[PDB]
Amino acid sequence: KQYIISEELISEGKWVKLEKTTYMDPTGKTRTWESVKRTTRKEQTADGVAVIPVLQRTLHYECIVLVKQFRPPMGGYCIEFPAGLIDDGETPEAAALRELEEETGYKGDIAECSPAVCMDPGLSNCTIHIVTVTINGDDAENARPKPKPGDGEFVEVISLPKNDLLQRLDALVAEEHLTVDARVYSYALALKHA
Amino acid sequence: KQYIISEELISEGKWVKLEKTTYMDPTGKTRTWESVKRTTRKQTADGVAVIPVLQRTLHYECIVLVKQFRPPMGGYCIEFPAGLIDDGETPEAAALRELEEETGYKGDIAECSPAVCMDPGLSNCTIHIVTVTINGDDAENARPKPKPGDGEFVEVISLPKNDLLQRLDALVAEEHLTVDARVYSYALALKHAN
Ligand SMILES: CNC(=O)c1cnc(C)s1
Ligand SMILES: [Cl-]
Ligand SMILES: [Mg+2]
Ligand SMILES: [Mg+2]
Ligand SMILES: [Mg+2]
Numbered sequence: 001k002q003y004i005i006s007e008e009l010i011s012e013g014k015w016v017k018l019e020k021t022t023y024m025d026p027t028g029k030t031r032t033w034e035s036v037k038r039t040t041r042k043e044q045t046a047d048g049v050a051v052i053p054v055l056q057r058t059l060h061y062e063c064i065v066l067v068k069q070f071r072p073p074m075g076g077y078c079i080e081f082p083a084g085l086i087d088d089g090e091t092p093e094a095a096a097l098r099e100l101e102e103e104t105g106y107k108g109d110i111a112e113c114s115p116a117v118c119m120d121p122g123l124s125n126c127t128i129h130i131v132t133v134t135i136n137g138d139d140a141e142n143a144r145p146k147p148k149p150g151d152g153e154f155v156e157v158i159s160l161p162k163n164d165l166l167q168r169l170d171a172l173v174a175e176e177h178l179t180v181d182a183r184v185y186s187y188a189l190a191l192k193h194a
Numbered sequence: 195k196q197y198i199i200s201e202e203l204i205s206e207g208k209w210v211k212l213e214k215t216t217y218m219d220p221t222g223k224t225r226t227w228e229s230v231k232r233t234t235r236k237q238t239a240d241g242v243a244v245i246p247v248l249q250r251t252l253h254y255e256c257i258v259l260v261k262q263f264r265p266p267m268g269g270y271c272i273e274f275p276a277g278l279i280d281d282g283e284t285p286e287a288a289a290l291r292e293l294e295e296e297t298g299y300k301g302d303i304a305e306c307s308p309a310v311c312m313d314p315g316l317s318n319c320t321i322h323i324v325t326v327t328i329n330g331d332d333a334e335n336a337r338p339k340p341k342p343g344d345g346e347f348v349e350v351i352s353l354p355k356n357d358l359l360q361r362l363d364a365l366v367a368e369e370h371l372t373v374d375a376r377v378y379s380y381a382l383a384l385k386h387a388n
């Protein structure tokens with residue numbers, strides 16, 4: 001029933017733009033919306049990847065590997081799945097494994113890759129692939145993981161046990177000023193609910 | 195170590211604005227970021243998203259989701275019921291209200307997250323994730339009345355909790371919809387648990 005009629009640029013930065021979207025509603029009436037888009041999406045199937053990294057080690061409980069960084073939009077520190085934008089020509093899987101190594105030091109193994117999923121669809125067209133990766137923490141490659149941050153990347157690694165993830169996140173939020181990401185929280189809530 | 199120095203308005207719509215954020219990197223170098231914010235916040239968070247667990251005896255437990263056209267996406271998305279929190283509304287009340295408006299179901303609060311970020315590399319947007327149970331055997335949820343506001347057009351899709359991720363992939367394959375990242379993350383963790 002519904003579709004886009006026109007997309008009028010309001011303001012274009014180097015990374016993000018704002019558009020006036022005109023669309024047809026299902027009564028047959030024309031309406032508008034304010035839409036955010038990135039300027040960096042070329043032929044990628046999504047803007048970015050977020051990695052769900054399951055750290056597996058003999059005689060350890062499985063951990064979920066998370067990262068903590070300063071996020072200028074939020075004006076503060078956030079706890080997130082490792083993530084980054086997909087480089088031109090790069091596959092989502094390759095982007096995931098690369099970002100996971102850059103942000104955490106770990107070399108993972110692909111498990112699964114989602115279709116493109118929407119970040120905040122009432123606001124933006126932004127999409128990611130959610131890529132589940134296992135990390136063999138018994139491998140020597142992953143014994144001394146050194147994050148290789150790119151320019152302006154400053155990332156702390158936080159590994160939390162899967163079997164207590166929500167409470168461990170709660171305990172971090174209780175101790176400092178820091179926001180947990182909605183996908184991380186959602187994943188932690190389902191681990192509780194299962 | 196990191197903090198905001200200043201924020202310069204680039205462009206302000208009725209609902210969304212774009213800013214150029216100046217911040218201090220951990221080395222003492224000053225850097226800029228393009229940030230999006232909503233113009234609507236007052237509140238604990240911009241919005242709520244509801245995880246609605248429909249419980250009917252002798253049936254599988256379902257998670258109630260909504261399908262709507264999303265102008266920034268140019269398409270239909272599958273999402274947790276959700277909306278912005280009204281000035282002077284609590285997140286719990288916003289959650290029960292939105293759930294009723296979007297689905298017609300009347301639920302009970304199970305738990306409420308702290309404010310969690312939507313896409314912290316892009317925006318300051320936050321929500322509370324509110325887990326709600328729905329007694330599907332109660333008379334008031336027999337023939338649920340969805341009460342849309344002006345210009346809302348929402349379809350309800352109930353999916354079994356125990357097979358959520360496979361049911362979502364199926365919808366994506368057959369119906370060319372985009373699943374929401376928080377929905378997909380929750381679905382993943384239901385499979386990954388134990
Ligand atoms: C790296 N510098 C930037 O200004 C941005 C990157 N991603 C954005 C949404 S803004
Ligand atoms: Cl529950
Ligand atoms: Mg990143
Ligand atoms: Mg990165
Ligand atoms: Mg809504």
Ligand SMILES: [Mg+2]
Binds near residue numbers: 276277296343346
């Ligand atoms: Mg509503």
